[PDB]
Amino acid sequence: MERIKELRDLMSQSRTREILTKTTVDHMAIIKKYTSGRQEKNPALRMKWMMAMKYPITADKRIMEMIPERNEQGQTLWSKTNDAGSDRVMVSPLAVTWWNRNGPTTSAVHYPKIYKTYFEKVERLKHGTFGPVHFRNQVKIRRRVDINPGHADLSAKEAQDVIMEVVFPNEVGARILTSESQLTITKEKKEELQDCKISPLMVAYMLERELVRKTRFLPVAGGTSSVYIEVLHLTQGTCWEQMYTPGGE
Amino acid sequence: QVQLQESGGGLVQAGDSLRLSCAASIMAWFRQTPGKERELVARLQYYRDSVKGRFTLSRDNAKNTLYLQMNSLKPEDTAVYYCAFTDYWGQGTQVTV
Amino acid sequence: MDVNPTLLFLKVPAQNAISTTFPYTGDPPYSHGTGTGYTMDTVNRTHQYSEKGRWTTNTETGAPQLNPIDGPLPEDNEPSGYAQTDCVLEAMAFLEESHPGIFENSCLETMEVVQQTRVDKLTQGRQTYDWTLNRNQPAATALANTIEVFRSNGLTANESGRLIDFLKDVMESMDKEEMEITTHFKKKQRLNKRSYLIRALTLNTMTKDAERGKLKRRAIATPGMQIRGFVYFVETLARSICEKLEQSGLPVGGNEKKAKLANVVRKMMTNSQDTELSFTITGDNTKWNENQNPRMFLAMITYITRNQPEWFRNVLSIAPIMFSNKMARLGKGYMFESKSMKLRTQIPAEMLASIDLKYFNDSTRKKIEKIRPLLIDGTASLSPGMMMGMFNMLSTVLGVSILNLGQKRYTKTTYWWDGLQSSDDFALIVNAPNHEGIQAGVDRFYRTCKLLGINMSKKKSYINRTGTFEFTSFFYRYGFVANFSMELPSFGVSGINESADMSIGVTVIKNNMINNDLGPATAQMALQLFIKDYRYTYRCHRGDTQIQTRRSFEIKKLWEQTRSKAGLLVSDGGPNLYNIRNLHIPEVCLKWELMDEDYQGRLCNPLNPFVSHKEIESVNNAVMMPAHGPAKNMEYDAVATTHSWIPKRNRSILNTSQRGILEDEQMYQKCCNLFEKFFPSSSYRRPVGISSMVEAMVSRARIDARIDFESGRIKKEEFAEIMKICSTIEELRRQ
Amino acid sequence: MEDFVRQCFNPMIVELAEKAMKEYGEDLKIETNKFAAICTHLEVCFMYSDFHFINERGESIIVESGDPNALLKHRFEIIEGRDRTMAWTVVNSICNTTGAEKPKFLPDLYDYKENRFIEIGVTRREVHIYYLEKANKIKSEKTHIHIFSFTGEEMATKADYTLDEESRARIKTRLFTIRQEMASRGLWDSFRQSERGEETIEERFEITGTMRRLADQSLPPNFSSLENFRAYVDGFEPNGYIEGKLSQMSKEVNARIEPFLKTTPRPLRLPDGPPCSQRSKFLLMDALKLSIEDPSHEGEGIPLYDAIKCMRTFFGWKEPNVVKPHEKGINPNYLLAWKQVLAELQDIENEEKIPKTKNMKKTSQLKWALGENMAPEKVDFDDCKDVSDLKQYDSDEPELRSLASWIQSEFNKACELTDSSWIELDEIGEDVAPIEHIASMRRNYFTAEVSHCRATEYIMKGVYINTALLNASCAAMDDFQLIPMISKCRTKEGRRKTNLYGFIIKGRSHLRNDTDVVNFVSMEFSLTDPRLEPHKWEKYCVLEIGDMLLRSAIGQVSRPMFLYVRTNGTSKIKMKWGMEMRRCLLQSLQQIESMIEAESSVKEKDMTKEFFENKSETWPIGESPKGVEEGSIGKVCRTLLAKSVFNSLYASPQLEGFSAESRKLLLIVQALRDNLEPGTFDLGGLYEAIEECLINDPWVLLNASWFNSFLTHALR
RNA sequence: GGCCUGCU
RNA sequence: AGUAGAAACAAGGCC
């Protein structure tokens, strides 16, 4: 109901009507990236400079109807002045902390299921067992190794169709996945995330990260396993070796 | 080319009846007078309001022939009556009430 | 006793303590005003290194151009751009012979990419010179403006959605009598053929800031949008070629560079017997970009693309053809001050052609006098050579050809050489039975380099025995030695957001521990200092302290409200649980089991009004410009929390005549959000097609209402309401 | 033939078919019979779908015209007439909502009763072959297929015909209308067989017009056209052309190697001129501290109250008077500013609660001291052209200045120990791995070594001052603000303490660019008389403000106590980089830990404890008139920390240039000392490159002097 | 005096 | 004055 209604409201005004009519689907990306905002050259300097202002961050308009304009002593939490090239409003950082102490609460039980990679890292490290540190010269030789320890033996494009069919089943188009490994992955990640309401985009991004294999060139000495490379900073050094066995093994 | 032959018409009394037919070697009847325009009679059943209940259009599909029954004719129905189909028209016949 | 750190080198070798010689703890030099002086100096220097060439006047642009190719051979060691066509063609032929099938294959993959590439690939670029407004703007904005102008002028082949079609339209625009542009102060202005040619062939010049390692500032250039597609295709070909060359090091990272350097030094020295001596030259090329003539790149590519479809050759040749006629905008201008009347003034650079020379000092006066003959419509012709490393990969190809030309099969002498080339820098390992052989080999290498328009900087180069050398701030001494002073500037808060900054800092510490041999205790100290700076920057202190800030009240009440305070994030005033073992874990997941369910739910709430995600590309990618290197992007692990807000924008557009761009931004974003709600996959996979917005949106409204009734909330009343509302918007689009 | 589609069919269908024509990219002028055939297919699709509605039952309601109501459901909903992307969108949506099977090709319609697809195709050939043809094209299909053909016959599997027969009579009447209308037209010479499935195209990228002429002007000097040059390139083969030009090229083009021996390198020449002055934003060696011995932590507390309490701890105030003038400014303004600061400090002391941040009055005194309303007003060139004085901004090499001995002593005392701990580090996760324990022990050793160091005190001073200045500039852009220089330490006894060096008055700070300058005036207490090294205080104004009595065995000194007052400035970049001075600790201690690890790779054991306690090994860390002096590892730590701190304090382009061009020569000298037969092509050029970076910066000149001393001691 | 902006 | 260094800041524009 609503969606077509703001569609009609947009088409009511002449300029947006022209934009909707003359613009083709292919140009979607271009106009979406059409912005006057330059990409910052020195982000640290301005982040240290903007945070000294009042209302340094930006938030959706809806914040004006969930968080009061001021806190107990009267420190303002949000302003009604919109951003430069968006309908979002500039708000103070307190509106963040406020949201974490009296804002609406939900059931975050499914975030562990979504962010599978990070929670698997945490579980692997929690059950790890350290050993003695041995001091001897390490011959670090540079090798190509896979960093992602949960890659399902799929490439970027190869798993992209799987991700769409898992999250966006209707926009798949011609592709119907042939490999049965992809079939089982789709089934599992479909039944697992059937009602998760985090965001389609973040779900797709994390599925891409988990399933897609990624490789990088690093100086290693021993190890060479996927689980042993994520902790390469902790097990191998310039003149010391720290024996380690992740919780998985 | 497919063409239509009107039959029927002639001079007829006020309150009297006529039978028109149209043979074809959606289908219709139409009429026209001096002083006005090409005037809608009937389609096949759909009619114009001025003509309802008085005139009954019907067809045969077997011998390719449509029929207009006109009952309770009035002076204002004096016209040339034409048939047509869906693009083509007949030559028309004159009905004088 | 007087303390002197440098004396420490008397006991510790120079490379083992080279980090001490990198003052990367202070503010790097910045430029303050116009870069016009540097642009003029660079143009004059590029034109006078090729003075002995031949002059001509282009019949299209009417600008004077200098061709030094096949010019007189140099008779001095000064920089020279007199490259010889036959010599470079022979070098490329030998490169092909030593690597058969390189050019044909690379051309095949490049042909595939060119004929399947899309227009949107041009949006994935940093600032570009929009000619519609004569100023630098984001790549997407400039592309959109150029497409709009083309469509308004009648060039609508780009509607096919293909980059090749966009380039076809671009070339067709060159043969138009009169184009039309828009200006706000809206006014429609007409550009004739020559003016549009110069606007499409021109470059925008700026001054490079944050450049560490030299006393003087330099100038850099940014091209337009008409020429970026050809550049993209040419660089794709060059990258595909260099990926097949082990002597190149430009298309790889740092660790790969080190590995290849070690391999080449071991190969050269190990194969050398006791009788052969080995010497390493740590060479830098003076005026690398100013001495590379685009015509020679045209020759190299046309030799590479031999026996290929003529359309491929044409599309790959268009780029150097435009660079050979490239023009450069002088710059921002010049600012004058009058102390007697106590005022200041800013004259644009376009007045340099006619403005009197009474206001300029002797140096600038002479520079303007020398560059004036080349001024055409406020821009100077820069045919002789490249401006700033636009063809990095082709230059690397030429250098690799030079390196391979001494494989001992072409030297025809006892001496021989090899090494690694990365544009403007090289390491050359030369072996020969005696010092005379080494001298002859280096002399011939230098001479051959001078025949290709490449000069070796004698002041910044030195030769020693193999085993010790330098390459792009990587010091090799019987094995590469860590520096850690190049990455020091990256140890602070990045400046993206709270969660992003935390993750980026911990990940940078981890990486520099893995690669740059950062010590454990040093890493712990870095973690402590980073946490301190992070808390002091975001006003998020431990919460149990009495440090009054603008955010210390809400943080303190959250602290007193929470029961398990060990689960609070550092952003919310909680303790830091990070350590050397936890540097690869996001903060949210490390504290997940310690958070109270109420705070956990409030933090990671999808309905939060702060989190905003635009595209799959910008989810967890942060662009950090590294010190002493080109802009780079990093993947940082982070969980989407309420702290993932995006900061405020500039907001200074409101005082400029270009104020309508914000309204267009808002309307485009509203339409894009509506489309995304209609097409959820709009962000992850960019939609493709040739239909218009409203068609897809209305038709999908039809179908989705239908099916969501066939099972879902909709009802007949609502379904029919949607159907007739779709009809209403249909008839509205009719009129 | 196109005249037929001009005449008969309605607009809607003709433009739908035209967009379907554009879909796959073939042109309509070459073959139009496909257009007519597929538009008739689309027409039968409509005429079969429309006029067919359903209500809550099955048994479709058929109405010749949809009446106004919610009962406008369509019996058959069309697939084709849409783009491929949307056709597959509808296919997938139907499959996911109907739970049916996804076909591999494009259907034409969907129906509810039987909950499935219809692929309508009316071909010229008779049905009973085309049906099974398209059937074997589609794999294992449950979608029912139904086709007509011009003769008037119908067929389907299951003997199934899904709706009314009068509609099918409609279809075949339409069909024979088409047929015996082409009869009037006469198209069957090709109508039955006009499409054979042609798909081929050649990509054409032709250079022509102006862009061709440009190609003719981008060739070597003796070429006339791109065609000729490409022909020459294709016909070119290597025939020893590099050798010919190498032989013909002049022999003066050479890269002769000049041997580098012990007697080759000469000392770097230093510039001569007036002595070098002080550039720091605060006093480093001559600072004085007023303290309270409070238990508050670094950030804990309120600045103004702490400053006032510290200042009340000192007795002996005198009416201030000029001792050493600025020599270029108006010292009475500095005097009046100091008295104003004192008066307003008392004014705060009187009132109820000390404000967290105070704003000062904008008197003419600080208007001059902060440089207010001195920027020339910006105007247009067309209005100021006849002014003779109008010229460029002064752009020349900075003034030349010779090194002085004060920077050496300042660095010497910047590496000395202190009676306080100036670093209070944060918390870290409790160490769980043995390597973490080793790291923590190492870190504790270095903290014990460097905390009691003047370099750490300077780090904290700079960080706090720059943080406060940046925050005040960003918050109070317009109005002058008072900020007391505060630094909190911990005594040997363990009691925490605060220290007040002085005050900073920040001025207007409307900073837009990263290079825009915010001016402030800094006042700092000290005891060092400025009458002994005046050249070091060229830009300072120094007053006499009191007398101090520090307990000494010589009765009690009762020394004078002066106030160094000056006008200084910074910028956003400088403030940001000065507030990250803590990474000097990193740099230094990373270097020391690299030393320790490198040495411990030799002996298979951690070597930190004996390095820090036994102090047997020592490194050359300075030279005394007797000779080179070596110190323990802790002294090396402090020396490197001081070097990094001074790099961060006296940063400048000169420093970067000298560092690079002297690291080059250092590497060459190291190669010489390693017996690696180093050689150079132009050493004079390198020397000139190094010597051009030494202009007036005290730090870079001191570094150059150190480099000369290192060369003198090396090369032996 | 009143109001706008701080990478456009 | 001061910062800074091959050109700039020491507020800008709009009424």
Author numbering:
A (entry chain C): 1 to 249
B (entry chain F): 1 to 25, 33 to 51, 58 to 99, 113 to 123
C (entry chain B): 1 to 185, 207 to 756
D (entry chain A): 1 to 716
Give the text the authors published on this PDB structure.
Central to the replication cycle of influenza viruses is the viral RNA-dependent RNA polymerase which transcribes and replicates the viral RNA genome. High-resolution structures of the complete viral polymerase from a number of human, avian and bat influenza A viruses, as well as influenza B, C, and D viruses have been determined. These structures have revealed that the polymerase is a highly flexible macromolecule that can assume a variety of distinct conformations, enabling the polymerase to perform both transcription and replication that require different initiation and termination mechanisms.
Using cryo-EM we determined the structure of 17 polymerase-nanobody complexes at resolutions between 4.5 and 6.7 Å; this is sufficient resolution to accurately position each nanobody bound to the polymerase heterotrimer. The most populous binding site, termed site 1, is on the PA endonuclease with five nanobodies (Nb8198, Nb8199, Nb8200, Nb8203, Nb8209) that bind at an interface formed by the short helix α1 (residues 1–10) and the long helix α6 (170–185). We have not determined the structures of Nb8211 and Nb8212 which, based on their similarity to Nb8200 and Nb8198, respectively, are expected to bind to the PA endonuclease.
